From a paper:
Here we describe the combination of rational and computational design to deliver three-helix bundle (3HB) peptide assemblies and single-chain proteins with control over topology and thermal stability. First, we garner sequence-to-structure relationships from antiparallel 3HBs in the Protein Data Bank. This gives core-packing rules, including layers of hydrogen-bonded polar residues, which are combined with surface-charge patterning to design complementary sequences for acidic (A), basic (B), and neutral (N) helices. Next, AlphaFold2 models for both designs are used to seed computational designs of single-chain proteins where the helices are connected by loop building.
To alter thermal stability in our designs without compromising the 3HB fold and topology, we sought to destabilise sc-apCC3-CW1 systematically by modifying its consolidated, largely Leu-based hydrophobic core. For this section, this parent design with a single polar layer of Asn@a, Thr@d, and Thr@d (N-T-T) in the B, A, and N helices is referred to as sc-apCC3-CW-1NTT. As hydrophobic core packing is a key stabilising force in water-soluble globular proteins, we investigated whether introducing additional polar layers could attenuate core stability without compromising the overall 3HB structure. CD spectra showed a progressive decrease in helicity with the addition of N-T-T layers.
Numbering used by the authors: -1 to 95
Write the structure that this text describes.
Amino acid sequence: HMMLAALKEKNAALKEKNAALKYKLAALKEKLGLTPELAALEKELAATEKELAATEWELAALEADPNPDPAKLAALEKKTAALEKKTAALEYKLAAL
């Protein structure tokens, strides 16, 4: 439960970051036009968003489980860390524009 509570908080921060990146992306599209780089970053943001939605389903099932599988919890933890790195990389690509 302790490790699952932290994963829920990390997921919450990731959804908030993804939303703000959406508004930054759209703002950059206005300032610079639809450049091929922005189109690539939008495609990467849309993908990352879909993986974030999928892992929230895993959080919910693990929360409902009276004895949550440590293996599934560890799989979610590594997936959350990968998405945190992917989102931070996308944030840097956007800030560089």
